[PDB]
Amino acid sequence: HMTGAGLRWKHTSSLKVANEPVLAFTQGSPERDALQKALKDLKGRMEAIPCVVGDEEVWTSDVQYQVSPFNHGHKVAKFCYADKSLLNKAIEAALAARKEWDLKPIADRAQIFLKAADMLSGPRRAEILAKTMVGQGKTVIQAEIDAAAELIDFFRFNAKYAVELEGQQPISVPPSTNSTVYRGLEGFVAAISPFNFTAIGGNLAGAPALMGNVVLWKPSDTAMLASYAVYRILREAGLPPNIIQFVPADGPLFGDTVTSSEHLCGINFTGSVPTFKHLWKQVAQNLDRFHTFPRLAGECGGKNFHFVHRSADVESVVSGTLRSAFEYGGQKCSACSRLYVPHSLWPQIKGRLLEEHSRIKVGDPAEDFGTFFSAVIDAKSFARIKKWLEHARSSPSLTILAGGKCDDSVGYFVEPCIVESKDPQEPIMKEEIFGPVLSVYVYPDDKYKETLQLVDSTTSYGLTGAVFSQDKDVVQEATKVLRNAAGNFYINDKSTGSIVGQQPFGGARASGTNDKPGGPHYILRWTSPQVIKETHKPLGDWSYAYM
Amino acid sequence: GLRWKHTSSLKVANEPVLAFTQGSPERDALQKALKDLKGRMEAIPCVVGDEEVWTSDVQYQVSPFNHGHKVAKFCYADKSLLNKAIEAALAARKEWDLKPIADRAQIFLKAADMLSGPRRAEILAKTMVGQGKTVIQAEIDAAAELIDFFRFNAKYAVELEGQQPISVPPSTNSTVYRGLEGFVAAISPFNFTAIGGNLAGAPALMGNVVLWKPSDTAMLASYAVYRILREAGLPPNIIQFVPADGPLFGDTVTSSEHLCGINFTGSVPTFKHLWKQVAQNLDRFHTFPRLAGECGGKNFHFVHRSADVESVVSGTLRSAFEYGGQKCSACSRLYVPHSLWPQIKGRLLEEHSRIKVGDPAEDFGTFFSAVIDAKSFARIKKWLEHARSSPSLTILAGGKCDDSVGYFVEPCIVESKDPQEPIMKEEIFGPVLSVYVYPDDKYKETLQLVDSTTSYGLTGAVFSQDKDVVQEATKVLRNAAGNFYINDKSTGSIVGQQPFGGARASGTNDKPGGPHYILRWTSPQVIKETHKPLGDWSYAYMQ
Ligand SMILES: O=P(O)(O)Oc1c2c(c(OP(=O)(O)O)c3c1[C@H]1C[C@@H]3c3cc4c(cc31)[C@H]1C[C@@H]4c3ccccc31)[C@H]1C[C@@H]2c2cc3c(cc21)[C@H]1C[C@@H]3c2ccccc21
C-alpha cells in the first residue's frame, strides 16, 4: 500500500516579483538630491579597484586607468589586468568552492540576489547610478534604466524564474519516484562584460552564479567603477568567496587562458561578433581537453531598423528614432541606425528630424542634467566613428543632413549625425558604428513591400527592429516578412528600452545565440539537470513474461 | 481583438508497454508482421520532398542475427542530392514555421496513434529484424518511447506557447517561438529507432526543416517511421530522408551557409569533429548553429552491503546485456562489496547459463540477439581477447564470439582486480559487464572512485536499503550520472518520467524526453506593441 504522508506529496515554491519602478528625477525629488550628492562624492576621488579572488584582493604589475568619457583628463578608477598565474589561481580556487555552492538550495542562492536587488533599489541606488554616469558617460535616465531598474529586475526575475524551474518536475508512476535536480554546470563559467550596460555585467556573472555555477568575471575596462560596485554589493549581499571572481584582464589574455583551461564549462559573452566567434573557434580547437562540452552564450551586433509606413504617427516616429539612435550616443546593441522613410512622408519627417536634432544638447551629464546624451566611451570607438563620419562626407551616395563634427579635446564628443543614403546597400546601412550616426533611406510608396524585403536582406544582423503604422494590415504583413529580421520587434515604439520580464532581449542571425536574457528560459543554459529515479519495490525476474 | 487570444493545453499519458503473452492479439499481429520480412528486401530511396531519388552508391542493411539476409537495399545521397535537399527544405521552411504549433503537433500526435495502433506490429518487426532487437527491447524503443517522444514533445511545444511575458499598459508583449533560420542536420544511431524519430521529429515539430541521415544499420525501421510522419500529414521538404556516408554528410552540412543545427546521437569523437567543422566554417554561417550531442556511456551499478541482493543481479543482468548491452545507458561497471560478492558471483554466473542468445524473430525465449554489424563485433572480440590476455582480468562467465550466421556475442562477465583498467573506462557497445570488488571498510573511497574513473557521466545506479548512504551517494555522484537510479537498473529511461542525458564527455545534456529539449530548436522573437503616441523625446528631469 501507499503512504499518506510520504512521497505521495509534491511542494512547489513561487515568487511574485514586480519591475523596479523608474524614478522621475524631477526638480525637488529626493533621488535627484541623493544622486547629485553621490556625483560630487566621486569628483577628485579615483577608486583603487583590485582583482578580487575569493576575499584576497590582489594587485598586479599591469595597472590600467578608467577615465570619464566626457573628461578623459580625470581618471575615475585605478585597476590592474590579472595575469595567467592569477587567472589560473582564480579558476582553481573557484572549482574548490563550486560543489558546496551548487549543493546550496536555490532559495538560499536566490535570497543573496534578492537582498542585493533591495539595497540596489534603496540606499546604494544613487552610488551605482553616479558611478555609471561618470564611468561610462550615461545621463541620469540612461543609468536609472540600466544600473538601477534592469540590474535589479535581472536579480529579481532570474531569482523568480529559478524557483519556478525547481517546481518543473517529471511524472512518477509506481514503484518509482522521479525528481529533476537542477545542477550548475561542472567547472567554471567565463563572464565577459561590455561597457554600455552595468546591468548586463551583473546578469552575465549573476545568472550563471544563481544556478550553482562559479564565475571568472572579466568586466569592461571602461565600465570598471560601476562594475566593481555591483560586485561589492553582491559580496555584502552574502555571496561566499570564489563564486564570482573579479578578474579584469587584457581581452586576448583572458580569452586564451579560460579556453585553454580543462575546467571551462561555459562562456557568457556580450560585445562584438568576431571576438565571440574567435572564442567559439578557440573552444573548438581545444575541445579534446575539456571535461564537459562548454556552453557558449553570446549577445553581439545589431544593425537595427525603424521602418516607417505612410500611415505612421510622424511625431512618434521622430521622438522614437531620436531616442533609439542617439540615447547614450547610440552605443546600444538595440540602437536604431537604419531609418526607412516613404517618399510622401519624407519632407515632413526630414524637416521635423533636423528641427528637433538642433534642440538636442550634448554636454557633461553630471553638471548639466539638460544633456540628452554625452561623449562616446573611448578614443578607439571615437576614431571608428570619426572614420564613419568622414565616410558620410567621402561616399557619393551619402549626404550628412545634420551633425557630422566631433571633438576629442575635452571628451570623446560626437554630434548626433543624420546621414541620407540614396543607396540602400551602402556599408553605412550594413556595418555597426556603435555611435550616434542614423542612416536614412527614402523609398517610393509603390515599392513599400520591396523595401520590407530590403530591410530583412540588407544586414547580417537580426537583433531589434520597429515598424510605425496606424494601418493594422501593414504591421500584420511587416510582422511576418521581418519575423527573423528582429529578435525584439516593436509596433509603434523605439527599438531600444527592453524591460526584463516584458521584452526578453536577444536576436538570431549574426546578433548571437538568442538565449533571451530577461525571459524565463535564459537560466536553462546555466543548469545541466540530473533526474533521480528511486524504485521502492524489489525489481523481480530479469526475464520477461513472453519467454 | 487586443486583450484576448486562444491558447491550448494538451494532457498526454505514456504509451503502455504491452506484455506480449501467448494468446494476446499484439503477439499474433507481430509474428504475422515478422513473417512478411522473412523473404522480402525493401528498396529504400532517398526522399527529397515527394521525389524518390536513387544514386550509384547503392548500400545494403542485413539482419544482425542472419547477415546472409539483405532486408533493406538503400543508397547514399551525394553532395549534389544533399545541397538539392537543403535548398528545397529552405523554400518550405517559412510557411512551415508560420504554421501554428497545434497544426504541427496534430501530425506527430496522429503519427504516434498510427505507431501505437495499426503500424505498431510493422515498426516492431522491422526494428527486431533490422537491428537485432528482441520483442520487449523493440516495444520500449520503436513503439513506447517513439509514441511518447511524439506525444510529450507535442505537449511541451503547446505548453511553451502559453509561456508569455508580462504586459504593462500602454504596451502589449507576446513571444513568437520561431524555428531556427536555416536547416537542422539530424544524425541518428542504430541502437534506438525512437531516438532517430526524435532527433529529426522534435526540431521539425518546432517549425524547423531537417536533413535526416539515419544509421545504415537501422535503415528499414527508420524509413518506416519517416513514412508514418509523411502520411500522418507532414508536408514535403520538412524532413528530407537522406541516407549518406557519415563523413561526407558531416562535410556537406558543416560547409552549407544555411546550417542552424546538428541534432547528433552516436560516437563522442564524431560529434567533436562536427563541432570543429562548424567552428572552422563559423564565418560563412548566417547564424550560430546549435549543436545537440548525445554521446558516451560507461555506466555503473554501485552496490552497498545493505542492498537487496536479488534486485542487484536481476537489474545488472538486464542493464548490461539487454540488446547485447548496446545502449548509451548500459551498465559496464559493477562495484560489489567483499562481504556480499560470494553471494552475487554465485547468482550472476547461475542466471548467465539460463540466457538464450539466438534468433529473436524465430525464438521469443531469446533474452538478447547478435550485436549490430561486423565492425561492432570485431571491437568486442578485441575486448574479449583483452579480457583473456590482461593480467588483472578474470573471465568469470562468457568469453567466446561466433560470426558464423550472425554477429553473436555471448554475455561476458569479467572480474577486474584493478578498477582503472581500460575495461572500466572505455565504451564497448556490446555484452561485456566488467566487475570490481571493494572492501565494506573502504566503501566511501570506492564511492569517490566510481566518480573519477571514466570521462563519461551519463547514467548510474546505487543499490542499498540503508537510506543514509543513498542520500550520501546522491551528493557524491552528482555529476557522475545525468540519470541517477536508486535500487533500479541504469537503462530503460521513460519519456516524461526520466528525461535522458548526462554531462561530462557523455554530451550536451539537452534532456530529450524532458520539457526543455524543444527550447534548443526555437529562437524566440518578442513583439512589443504600444497603442498610444510616444510623446516627446526629452524627459521631465532635463527641463
Ligand atoms: O491509491 P493510492 O493510496 O492513492 O496510491 C496510489 C497512487 C498511484 C498509484 O498508481 P496508479 O496511478 O497506476 O494507480 C497507485 C496507488 C495505489 C494503487 C496504485 C498502486 C500501486 C502500488 C501500490 C499502491 C498503489 C503499492 C503496490 C504498488 C506499489 C508500488 C510502490 C510502492 C507501493 C505500492 C499513483 C497515485 C498514487 C501515487 C502515489 C505515488 C506515485 C504514484 C501514485 C508515485 C509517487 C507516489 C509513489 C510512491 C511509490 C512509488 C511511486 C510513487
Segments making up each domain of chain A, as ranges: 30-300+512-530, 304-491
Distance CA B446, CA A370 (A): 69
Best CA proximity match to A263, nearest among A241, A292, A298: A292
Q: What is the DSSP letter of A408?
A: -
Query: Using an 8 Å Cβ cutoff, are B436 and B341 in contact?
Result: no
Closest residue by Cα to atom 40, ligand 1, is A8
> Using CA atoms, how far apart are residues A327 and A143, in angstroms rounded to an integer?
11
Q: Cα separations (Å) of B208 from B63, B131, B285?
A: 33, 29, 16
Q: Are B432 and B396 in contact (CB under 8 A)?
A: no
Q: How far is the CA of A533 from the centre of ligand 1 (A)?
A: 15
Quickly tell me which residue has 581618471 as its cell: A75
Pairing of strands B459-463, B483-486: parallel
Q: Is A118 exposed, middle or buried (0-12, 13-18, 19+ CB in 10 A)?
A: middle
Residue type, A515: D
Q: Which residue, A314, A398, A323, A308, is CA-closest to A357?
A: A323
Place of cell 535537399: B85
Return the residue in A10, A292, A480 with the most chain B beta carbons within 10 A, the one to mutate for interface testing: A292
Put residue A395 in one of left, alpha, beta given phi > 0 → left and psi -120 to 50 → alpha. Answer: beta
Report which residue type is found at B326.
Answer: Q
Chain B: nearest CA to A65, how far in angstroms? 31
* Strand A406-407 versus strand A413-414 pairing type: antiparallel
3-state secondary structure of A245: strand
Q: Quick one: B358 exposed, middle or buried, by C-beta within 10 A (0-12, 13-18, 19+)?
A: middle
H-type helices in A192-313, by residue range? 198-210, 224-235, 251-260, 273-285
What are the φ and ψ backbone dihedral angles of A56, each rounded to 5 degrees? -70, 110
N- to C-terminal Cα distance for chain B? Answer: 39
Contact B488 A539 (CB under 8 A): yes
The residue whose CA is least distant from atom 46 of ligand 1 is A8
Q: Which amino acid is at B245?
A: D
Atom of ligand 1 nearest to the CA of A172: 44
d(CA A120, CA A126): 9
C-alpha cell at A222: 571602461
Fold observed for domain A304-491: Aldehyde Dehydrogenase; Chain A, domain 2 (3.40.309)
Cα B438 to Cα A392, B304, B343, B447, distances in angstroms: 76, 10, 14, 10
CA dist A184 → A105, B47, B460 (Å): 11, 42, 19
Strands B408-409 and B401-402: antiparallel
Q: Report CA(A174)–ligand 1 centroid distance (Å).
A: 5
Cis, bond preceding B170 (omega within 30 deg of 0)? yes
As a dihedral over the C-alpha atoms of residue A122, residue A126, residue A131, residue A132, rounded to 10 degrees, the angle is 80
- Distance, in Å, from the CA atom of B493 to the CA atom of B495, rounded to the nearest integer, reads 7
Asked whether the beta carbons of residue A25 and residue B484 sit closer than 8 angstroms, the reply is no
Please list, in sequence order, all residues whose beta carbon lies within 8 angstroms of the beta carbon of residue B495, skipping any fewer than 6 positions away: B14, B145, B148, B149, B152, B512, B513
**Does residue A175 line the site of ligand 1, with CB under 6 A?**
yes
CB contact under 8 A, B525 and A489: yes
Rg of chain B over Cα atoms, rounded to whole angstroms, equals: 25
Q: What residues contact residue A444 under an 8 Å CB cut-off, 6+ apart?
A: A342, A343
Q: Which of B166, B308, B351 sits opposite A542 (nearest CB)?
A: B351
Interchain pair A493, B278: CB under 8 A:
no
Query: Closest Cα of chain A to B533: distance in Å?
Result: 6
Q: Report the C-alpha gap between A207 and A153 in whole angstroms.
A: 12
Instruction: Quote the minimal CA–CA distance from A478 to chain B in Å.
Output: 12
Expt. technique: X-ray
Asked whether the beta carbons of B371 and B324 are under 8 A apart, the reply is yes
Cβ(B369)–Cβ(B134) under 8 Å?
yes
Using a CB-CB cut-off of 8 Å, the residues of chain A touching B478 are 99, 102-103, 181, 183, 530
Of A203, A212, A184, which is closest to residue A515 (Cα–Cα)? A203
- DSSP summary character for residue A72: E
* Ligand 1 atom at shortest distance from the alpha carbon of A1: 26
Q: How far apart are CA B320 and CA B432, in angstroms?
A: 7
| Pocket mutation for ligand 1, best pick of A2, A10, A533, A535 (most atoms within 8 Å of C-beta) | A2
Residue nearest atom 30 of ligand 1, based on CA coordinates: A175
Measure in Å the smallest separation between the Cα of B68 and chain A Cα atoms.
26
Enumerate the β-bridge partners of residue A489.
A465, B527
What CATH number was assigned to the domain covering residues B299-486? Answer: 3.40.309.10
Residue B147 neighbours by CB under 8 Å, 6+ apart: B15, B112, B115, B116
Across A214-234, b (16+ Cβ under 10 Å) vs e yields bbbbbbbbbbbbbbbbbbbbb
d(C-alpha A92, C-alpha B380), whole Å: 39
β-pair partners for A191: A217, A268
Spell out the CATH class of A30-300+512-530: alpha beta
Other C-beta atoms lying within 10 Å of the C-beta of residue A121: 17
Cα-to-centroid distance, B19 and ligand 1 (Å): 20
Q: What are phi and psi of A164, to 5 degrees?
A: -70, -30
- Say if the Cβ atoms of B365 and A502 lie within 8 Å: no
A541: cell is 525476474
Regarding beta strands A71-80 and A63-68, do their DSSP bridges make them parallel or antiparallel, or are they unpaired?
antiparallel
Do residue A491 and residue B19 have CB atoms under 8 angstroms apart? no
Angle at B380 between CA B379 and CA B386, to 5 degrees: 95
d(CA B73, CA B212): 18
DSSP structural state of residue A184: B
Cell triple for residue B193?
529507432
- CB neighbours of residue B18 within 10 Å: 19
**Residue recorded with cell 568486442:** B380
d(Cα A407, Cα A481) in Å, to the nearest integer? Answer: 41
C-alpha B400/C-alpha B388 separation (Å) is: 10
What is the spatial distance between Cα B197 and Cα B300, in angstroms, rounded to a whole number?
28
Nearest CA in chain B to A169: B497
SS (H, E, C) A93-141: HHHHHHHHHHHCCHHHHHHHHHHHHHHHHCCCHHHHHHHHHHHHCCCHH
**Residue type at A75?**
K
Give B153-200 as a 3 state SS string: HHHHHHHHHHCCCCCCCCEEEEEECCCCCCEEEEECCCCCHHHHHHHH
DSSP letter at A291? Answer: S
A337: part of which helix (H) or strand (E)? strand A336-342
Identify the H or E element spanning B341: helix B341-353
Question: Whose C-alpha lies nearest to ligand 1, atom 3?
Answer: A2
Q: How many helices (H) and strands (E) does chain B have?
A: 17, 23
Other CB atoms closer than 10 Å to residue B17's CB: what's the count? 15
Question: Residues 6 or more apart from B520 whose CB is under 8 A from it?
Answer: B261, B290, B292, B510
Are A355 and A501 in contact, with CB atoms under 8 Å apart?
Answer: no
Using the structure block, give the residue that is written with the C-alpha cell 501554428: B100
| Rounded distance between C-alpha atoms, residue B489 and residue B314, angstroms | 9
Q: Who among A170, A503, A512 is closest to B288 (CB)?
A: A512
CATH level 3 topology of B29-295+507-527: Aldehyde Dehydrogenase; Chain A, domain 1 (3.40.605)
Phi-psi region for residue A518, left (φ > 0), alpha (ψ -120 to 50) or beta? left
Runs of H (alpha helix) within B281-340: 309-321
Which residue in B402, B366, B383 sits closest to B132, CA to CA? Answer: B366
3-state secondary structure at position B237: coil
Q: What share of chain B is helix, strand, coil (3-state, %, to 5)?
A: 40, 20, 40
Query: Ligand 1: distance of its center to the CA of A1 in Å?
Result: 7
Relative to beta strand A336-342, strand A508-509 is unpaired
φ/ψ (deg, to 5) at A218: -95, 105
In chain A, helix, strand, coil percent, each to 5? 40, 20, 40
Cell of B439: 572492501
C-alpha–C-alpha distance, residues B308 and A294, integer Å? 39
Cell of B318: 538486464
* HEC assignment per residue over A424-463: CCCHHHCCCCCCCEEEEEEECHHHHHHHHHHHHHCCCEEC
**Beta-carbon-side half-sphere exposure of residue A526 (alpha carbons within 13 Å):** 32
Active site residues of A: 299, 333
Instruction: Provide the edge-to-edge strand list for the sheet that holds B331-337.
Output: A176-181, A530-535, B483-486, B459-463, B299-303, B331-337, B432-438, B412-416, B393-397
CA-based radius of gyration for chain A: 25
Which residues of A define the annotated binding site for substrate?
498
User: How many other β-carbons are positioned within 10 Å of the β-carbon of residue B103?
Assistant: 10
Whether the Cβ atoms of residue B230 and residue B240 lie closer than 8 Å to each other: no
Q: At B263, is the secondary structure helix, strand, or coil?
A: strand
B525: cell is 522573437
Specify the DSSP class assigned to residue A228. Answer: H
Burial-class residue B118 by CB neighbours within 10 Å (0-12, 13-18, 19+).
exposed
**Angle subtended at Cα B261 by Cα B260 and Cα B264, rounded to the nearest 5 degrees:** 165
Pairing verdict, β A488-491 and A464-468: parallel
Beta strands B42-43 and B66-75, pairing class = parallel
Beta bridge partners of A336: A304
Report the alpha-carbon distance of residue B500 to residue A530 in Å, rounded: 9
Placement of cell 560596485 in the chain = A229
Cα distance between residue A207 and residue A295, in whole Å: 14
Is there a common fold for A30-300+512-530 and A304-491?
no
